[PDB]
Ligand binder design. Sequence first.
Ligand SMILES: Nc1ncnc2c1ncn2[C@@H]1O[C@H](COP(=O)(O)OP(=O)(O)OP(=O)(O)O)[C@@H](O)[C@H]1O
Ligand SMILES: Nc1ncnc2c1ncn2[C@@H]1O[C@H](COP(=O)(O)OP(=O)(O)OP(=O)(O)O)[C@@H](O)[C@H]1O
Ligand SMILES: Nc1ncnc2c1ncn2[C@@H]1O[C@H](COP(=O)(O)OP(=O)(O)OP(=O)(O)O)[C@@H](O)[C@H]1O
Ligand SMILES: Nc1ncnc2c1ncn2[C@@H]1O[C@H](COP(=O)(O)OP(=O)(O)OP(=O)(O)O)[C@@H](O)[C@H]1O
Lengths: 217, 216, 216, 217
Amino acid sequence: NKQFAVIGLGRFGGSIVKELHRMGHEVLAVDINEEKVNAYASYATHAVIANATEENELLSLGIRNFEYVIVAIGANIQASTLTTLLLKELDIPNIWVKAQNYYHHKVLEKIGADRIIHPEKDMGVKIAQSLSDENVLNYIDLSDEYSIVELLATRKLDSKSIIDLNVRAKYGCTILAIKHHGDICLSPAPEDIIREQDCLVIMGHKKDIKRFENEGM
Amino acid sequence: KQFAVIGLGRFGGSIVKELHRMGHEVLAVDINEEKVNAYASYATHAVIANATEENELLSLGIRNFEYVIVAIGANIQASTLTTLLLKELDIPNIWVKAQNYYHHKVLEKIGADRIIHPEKDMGVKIAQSLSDENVLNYIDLSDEYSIVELLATRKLDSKSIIDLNVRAKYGCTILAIKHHGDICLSPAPEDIIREQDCLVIMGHKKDIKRFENEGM
Amino acid sequence: KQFAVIGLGRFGGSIVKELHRMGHEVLAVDINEEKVNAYASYATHAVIANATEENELLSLGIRNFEYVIVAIGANIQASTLTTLLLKELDIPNIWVKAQNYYHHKVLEKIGADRIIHPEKDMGVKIAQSLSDENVLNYIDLSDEYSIVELLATRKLDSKSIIDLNVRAKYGCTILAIKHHGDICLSPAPEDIIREQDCLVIMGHKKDIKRFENEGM
Amino acid sequence: NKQFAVIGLGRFGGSIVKELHRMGHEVLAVDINEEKVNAYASYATHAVIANATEENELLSLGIRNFEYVIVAIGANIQASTLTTLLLKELDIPNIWVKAQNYYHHKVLEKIGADRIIHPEKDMGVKIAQSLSDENVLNYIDLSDEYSIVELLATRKLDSKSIIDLNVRAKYGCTILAIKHHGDICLSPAPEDIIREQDCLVIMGHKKDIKRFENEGM
Ligand SMILES: Nc1ncnc2c1ncn2[C@@H]1O[C@H](COP(=O)(O)OP(=O)(O)OP(=O)(O)O)[C@@H](O)[C@H]1O
Ligand SMILES: Nc1ncnc2c1ncn2[C@@H]1O[C@H](COP(=O)(O)OP(=O)(O)OP(=O)(O)O)[C@@H](O)[C@H]1O
Ligand SMILES: Nc1ncnc2c1ncn2[C@@H]1O[C@H](COP(=O)(O)OP(=O)(O)OP(=O)(O)O)[C@@H](O)[C@H]1O
Ligand SMILES: Nc1ncnc2c1ncn2[C@@H]1O[C@H](COP(=O)(O)OP(=O)(O)OP(=O)(O)O)[C@@H](O)[C@H]1O
């Protein structure tokens, strides 16, 4: 099918190899630290001690055999940039790299990393949103303006109805799901009961939702 | 009202930086001087302090904060001691970064209010996108049901939504279409889907992957 | 023209020291305090600064400089970041020292204007002089044609310019003779060549070595 | 076959051992760092891990077999001085050493190094010349006063003739070569066309050339 190589068994890298392997893919786990390789031995199709900045060592892995190579070295900029440069030079189709900061992202961009990820910064802003707005449990941005948000229902909604407390007429948003005591009602039909601490999944404009949050909850 | 970010990591530093951009009251704490100096501009306040020493934590007036975030994820000893102090000092909400399953366990037992694994979580999400080249982004509603954002293949170019019904056929529902940046929230059949458009589907996790196989 | 030398190495420090002796405007930058103090006297100006931090580079007023030289050749991370900053800050001429082929490649891609390998270059030149004990110094005009300075053997002692011709015999041309320090430029046949006198020949690289074999 | 020994596989040393070997000489690559030796294994007649300051280790290499020994240790003064002292004591005919600074040069001079080189300082002044004078591409000094200089032709010379814009009479210098679009004209005969960005090779007095640079270009 398709073959994966995870260079850098960080908390990020190690989670990718561990997941991809649980999904039952072909994953090569690479790390310069022996102890890290030994640890992920059981959680990878394969584990190998190698310094990803040395070319001959990368060829020994048969890196050219991989469709996707992930460089999850995010603390060492020098290790990361050199490795990704090697990978691009060795004509790897998809190179996904972890970046440290804006500048590291810039170097990776210029040496042709195919997709760059800031796992910490991204999770940072998402957690910050949940801190600031105690109502938002989780969310996904469709664009800069429009977003799907999962909200914890306050007592301000306990035993309330949809045909009653409408959103798309009143706020221009649409409710997609309700989760009461673990049970899930997708594409719910008005009227439905919403209890307190229910997961309410709303969808629309980012500003529109926060207006509903203010006045509805 | 008031936020305290202890540990200006890449994770911690992003929280302070964001909360401050949102215009909240954020206290940036770090034992490393250079880190404090860096986040000075991106915080309501910056202070050099060793969060494991009690008197130093009191000097910050930590008891003044509604939410304290311990984004120390490499040092288990630093993290556990700090969080223990915070719980002992009766902070209402303590959010901590964990390193691994075991560190999570120690934090759980000393009463951290919410524990986060930013790397492991982002790990599984990125792995999903690696394995399934179609899934751009997603959010899990539960273990079984999920909302998924999909990149449309040539297998969908100039297809009508009602023509290629996801609902009747697969038990899923299409929520949005993004063509050339323009967004059609809650789209009405029929609508044109071009190649490389963002298709937002919703339903059962297994059901979606069945649509991915046969539809795309 | 205003010059900025970031990295007071043996290489960087020599550029600063020379440009300053020539009486230009040179800003000497280094993260190591002791290095800055040392080159204080040998620069228009010396400043302790970490060239990878942007605000620190702006504090120098780096955007003031026509030519900035990054003579950091041991630290690849320092070098690449600095040069990236310099390109981002729209510096017209960025001259960087490289460590190896790969470092050269990263610098190339982030838009360094001229890349130099002072050690590798001087390596091959010294190697030539080792292998061929006759060649004192040289300059390549191309890959094939070169001007070479040769130490005259006893095989040439008291030989005449026309007598031992190269303009007809080998297709090369003699440009200068240096006997006991005295210099005869574009010499007219016949001229006396003593032993150990610097002979400056010019032509094809292969042609010269043929003259070296048969003439000397 | 003349025999070469390169002690210290720096960027400088490693370049000598890589070049001499490409020329197909006999070169012994020595370094105390294992990883360095392993790297230059392919690019040397031989590679050996050895501490050049220990005598017995130097004898084990059979150093007395070598006509030319190059000590390209330029960061460690103690390593360099001791090594060179050993080499002189062991009666090596030609000892070429890399120096760090004026003082290191002095120590080497007194312990009988046969030729001392400052690769960085030398390349420093040459590059500085090219920075200051944007016209000079490359040069070679015949003495302190007289020099052969390679110059990039400005628009101030585009489609100009040789005998038209004479140097042999006007400035006391002589043009030796012209390089237009890669093609090379050695000992050019007046008149010849000089286009813009054409490599012009002039020869004469250092002051004389810069006078031509000012008024001609
Ligand atoms: N040259 C290399 N080749 C392969 N792996 C390397 C190399 N250098 C470092 N690593 C490994 O890559 C992994 C990436 O960790 P990195 O410590 O440098 O920090 P990190 O990306 O911030 O970690 P985390 O994912 O937990 O946030 C480590 O296990 C490290 O040993
Ligand atoms: N005793 C302490 N008190 C307060 N802050 C500390 C203390 N010890 C360490 N820190 C800081 O807290 C932060 C925690 O970072 P830690 O490097 O050690 O890894 P990390 O949290 O996983 O990094 P990252 O967030 O980038 O993934 C760092 O800025 C560190 O300097
Ligand atoms: N971020 C920085 N900002 C300014 N100067 C720096 C920075 N980082 C390193 N330097 C300085 O630049 C130089 C780094 O180059 P490196 O000395 O280690 O030597 P080199 O370029 O490989 O060769 P050489 O010493 O012969 O010039 C050092 O002098 C160091 O003090
Ligand atoms: N005592 C020794 N015995 C054997 N090898 C040594 C000894 N000392 C240094 N070396 C090696 O010789 C080399 C000399 O490099 P040196 O770092 O010390 O600085 P350098 O001459 O400025 O480097 P560069 O050639 O890049 O300019 C290194 O590879 C080093 O490992």
